[PDB]
Paper text:
The crystal structure of glycerol-bound SaSsbA was successfully determined at a resolution of 1.8 Å. While SaSsbA is typically active as tetramers, this glycerol-bound structure contained only two monomers of SaSsbA within each asymmetric unit. In contrast to the crystal structure of apo-SaSsbA, this structure displayed two additional amino acid residues, namely P105 and K106, as indicated by the blue mesh, solely in the subunit A of SaSsbA. In congruence with the apo form, the overall architecture of this glycerol-bound SaSsbA monomer remained characteristic of an OB-fold structure, marked by a β-barrel (composed of 5 β-strands) crowned with an α-helix. Within this structure of an SaSsbA dimer, two glycerol molecules (designated as Glycerol 1 and Glycerol 2) were present. However, these glycerol molecules exhibited distinct binding patterns to SaSsbA (see below). Among these interacting residues were F48 (Subunit B), N50 (Subunit B), S79 (Subunit A), R80 (Subunit A), F91 (Subunit A), V92 (Subunit A), and T93 (Subunit A). In light of the interactions identified through PLIP, it was established that the main chains of R80 and V92, along with the side chains of S79 and T93, partook in hydrogen bonding with Glycerol 1. Specifically, M1 (Subunit A), L2 (Subunit A), N3 (Subunit A), R4 (Subunit A), T36 (Subunit B), F37 (Subunit B), R76 (Subunit A), and D98 (Subunit A) were observed to participate within contact distance (<4 Å) in binding interactions with Glycerol 2. The structural evaluation conducted via PLIP underscored that the main chains of M1, N3, and T36, as well as the side chain of R76, were pivotal components in the hydrogen bonding network, fostering the binding of Glycerol 2.
Single-stranded DNA-binding proteins (SSBs) play a crucial role in DNA metabolism by binding and stabilizing single-stranded DNA (ssDNA) intermediates. The majority of SSBs adopt homotetrameric configurations for activity. Diverging from E. coli, which harbors a solitary SSB variant (EcSSB), certain bacteria like Staphylococcus aureus exhibit a more complex scenario with the presence of three paralogous SSBs, specifically referred to as SaSsbA, SaSsbB, and SaSsbC. Of these, SaSsbA may be an EcSSB counterpart due to its possession of an acidic tip and sequence resemblance to EcSSBn.
Residue numbers in the entry:
A (entry chain A), D (entry chain A): 1 to 37, 45 to 106
B (entry chain B), C (entry chain B): 1 to 39, 43 to 104
The structure:
């Protein structure tokens, strides 16, 4: 079934590396995406070596584009509370501000 | 900037439909969207919200298991629950919902 | 940069299906996509192309009038026709096609 | 039915104004959109006063984002040849390079 999300926004902080529960390495970052009418704060996840591009080319405040799909998941946090999240899993990340 | 979501999936339950005392219709539903990649195929469960005439239409025509398309924007919001914990919410706010069955 | 198209519509004709002598499957079809805005409602007619296993699937399951979803990219190309005129082509190259019926 | 296209690219030339066959005024421009693997050249159309934003903020080479729908149409050109086109009709245009 169809599942596509496209965003352009600015990173709220420097990107990071994490490993998924299965031991898969990813890059993560949060985009502040301005509305056309205020902003939304969207957590993005990048698999494969694109994670290295993300962690080297992007920093806090960088403009980035993402083309990906929405994925849901949940987990129990440190305090023992179940957190439910919806994240953008990136098919590609575009570095719109190279200089 | 840019913020666009397009999904096709099936509602997990009958939509929930209410009218604020101000008169704005609101409908919510969760879209189950099967993945194309083959884990064994899993699904994602996306919480959707729609307003006004689109919400009226959703209530009149969609139910549990209905196939639907949504065209919308990803929105985040924050709230404090009754236990005092800050809860972060991500939802798709639908500009339109298409009835595919 | 970014280039993403998502459509849901009905095929105007049976897909056309061929295999290059190199062995790559190719399917083409035109998607009729009804407009949401009310002119009297009109439709847009988008030429789609798909390759490899997706093309095989399109040939096996889709026909004239079938409801389908496409997830893809807009591509432009140029050609000279037999009368010597340069023809500009815009097509959707499909990353996947979903069968909605 | 669903019909959505999202692009980021650079204008190939300065934007223009045109009026449709029914006398409706629009802005037009062409985006060069790089591929992730070369570019595609996509004609965009903007209705309403957003046409004025487009013709003042964007110029040749400007980075722009568009969120819109694909529309088909055809017409007979000057030489009397029927031309078939598919254009992006913009719900919004994002001016990604303000400075």
């Amino acid at each position: 079934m169809l599942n596509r999300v496209v965003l352009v926004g600015r990173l709220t902080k420097d990107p990071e590396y994490r490993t998924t529960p299965s031991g898969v390495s990813v890059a993560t970052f949060t985009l502040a995406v301005n509305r056309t009418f205020e902003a939304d704060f969207i957590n993005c996840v990048v698999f494969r070596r694109q994670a290295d591009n993300v962690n080297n080319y992007l920093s806090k405040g960088s403009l980035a584009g993402v083309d990906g799909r929405l994925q849901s998941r949940n987990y129990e946090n440190q305090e023992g509370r179940r957190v439910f999240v919806t994240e953008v899993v990136c098919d590609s990340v575009q570095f719109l501000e190279p200089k």
